Enzyme design. Structure first.
Site, PDB file in Angstrom:
ATOM      1  N   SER A  49       0.819  -1.206   0.000  1.00 45.70           N
ATOM      2  CA  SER A  49       0.000   0.000   0.000  1.00 45.70           C
ATOM      3  C   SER A  49       0.860   1.267   0.000  1.00 45.70           C
ATOM      4  O   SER A  49       1.635   1.489  -0.934  1.00 45.70           O
ATOM      5  CB  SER A  49      -0.915  -0.045   1.231  1.00 45.70           C
TER       6      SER A  49
ATOM      7  N   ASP B 189      -9.958  -6.466  -3.887  1.00 49.27           N
ATOM      8  CA  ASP B 189      -9.444  -5.362  -3.076  1.00 49.27           C
ATOM      9  C   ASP B 189     -10.497  -4.251  -3.087  1.00 49.27           C
ATOM     10  O   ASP B 189     -10.809  -3.696  -4.141  1.00 49.27           O
ATOM     11  CB  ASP B 189      -8.137  -4.836  -3.688  1.00 49.27           C
TER      12      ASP B 189
ATOM     13  N   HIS C 164      -7.218  -6.385   0.026  1.00 45.47           N
ATOM     14  CA  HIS C 164      -6.088  -5.483   0.239  1.00 45.47           C
ATOM     15  C   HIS C 164      -4.963  -6.103   1.070  1.00 45.47           C
ATOM     16  O   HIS C 164      -3.786  -5.842   0.826  1.00 45.47           O
ATOM     17  CB  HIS C 164      -6.557  -4.180   0.899  1.00 45.47           C
TER      18      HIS C 164
END
Ligand SMILES: NC(=O)[C@@H](N)Cc1ccc(O)cc1
Ligand SMILES: [Mg+2]
Ligand SMILES: [Mn+2]
Length: 254
Positions: A102, A207, A235
């Protein structure tokens, strides 16, 4: 077995965890409000300790790298990228590979582009190189930690305490908003073409935070990169599907 410690880097005492005896050094970069303790347990435990020497760092203001408290200047991703590379250099590694999740994937992309002679290979997942209107609805929707998932909030609330967690999350959203005002809502679109190392972009098709077009874009502009889609991945795919992810990462890094 994992060892935790702090090292002085660019004026801050950064916390990190390290394990393994391998000659291939790997840095695990956590996402927003993340840390080695909350974001990389499976990797610090299972990544091959004979092949790699794994380090999981806590960006300044995150995890145990406090003080200082976290703030988000316009160049906060670049500041983290510099700290990450300087931390590994301070730990005496001559070259490293990066596993970024991320915000950590964004950070990794920037590090590879700015310090190409120091990065061997890179594995990133859940990263976005810019922000769109569709993204705005997403990050604005997570500003209030109150609505956060009970399971996802517990670990961060325990590590930071409700107050720091809540406030830093609000400051994070404010920081992202600033990118929306820039040309192309840019975060690191301009650095993608400057990544010179082999890269593997992983994306969980389910996600809910990062639309797949972001992974397709990074794949498109990072020369020689490979894109791996996981049909059931969300995610947090490296945690929910750790064995699958670790195998994927280990194969790519060798
Ligand atoms: N955990 C993190 O590091 C965030 N980048 C996850 C996130 C991505 C996109 C968003 O619109 C909102 C949140
Ligand atoms: Mg444009
Ligand atoms: Mn830590």
């Amino acid at each position: 077995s994992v060892t935790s410690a702090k090292v002085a880097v660019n004026g801050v005492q950064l916390h990190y965890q390290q394990t393994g005896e391998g000659d291939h050094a790997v840095l695990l970069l956590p996402g927003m409000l993340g840390s080695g303790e909350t974001d990389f347990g499976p990797q610090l435990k299972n990544l091959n300790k004979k092949l790699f020497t794994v380090v999981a760092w806590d960006p300044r203001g995150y995890g145990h790298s406090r003080p200082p408290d976290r703030d988000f200047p316009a160049d906060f991703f670049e500041r983290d990228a510099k700290d990450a590379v300087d931390l590994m250099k301070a730990l005496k590694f001559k070259k490293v590979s990066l596993l970024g999740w991320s915000d950590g994937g964004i950070t990794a992309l920037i590090a590879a582009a700015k310090y190409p002679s120091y990065i061997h290979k890179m594995v990133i997942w859940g990263a976005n190189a810019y922000v769109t209107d569709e993204d705005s609805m997403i990050y604005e929707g997570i500003r209030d930690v109150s609505k956060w998932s009970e399971r996802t909030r517990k670990p961060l609330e325990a590590l930071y305490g409700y107050d720091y967690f809540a406030r830093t999350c609000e400051k994070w959203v404010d920081g992202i908003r600033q990118f929306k005002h820039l040309p192309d809502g840019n975060i690191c679109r301009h650095l993608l073409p400057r990544v010179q190392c082999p890269a593997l972009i992983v994306h969980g098709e389910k996600d809910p935070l990062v639309p797949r077009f972001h992974a397709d874009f990074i794949h498109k502009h990072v020369k020689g990169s490979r894109l791996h889609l996981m049909p059931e991945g969300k995610h947090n795919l490296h945690l929910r599907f750790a064995d699958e992810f670790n195998k994927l990462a280990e194969d790519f890094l060798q």
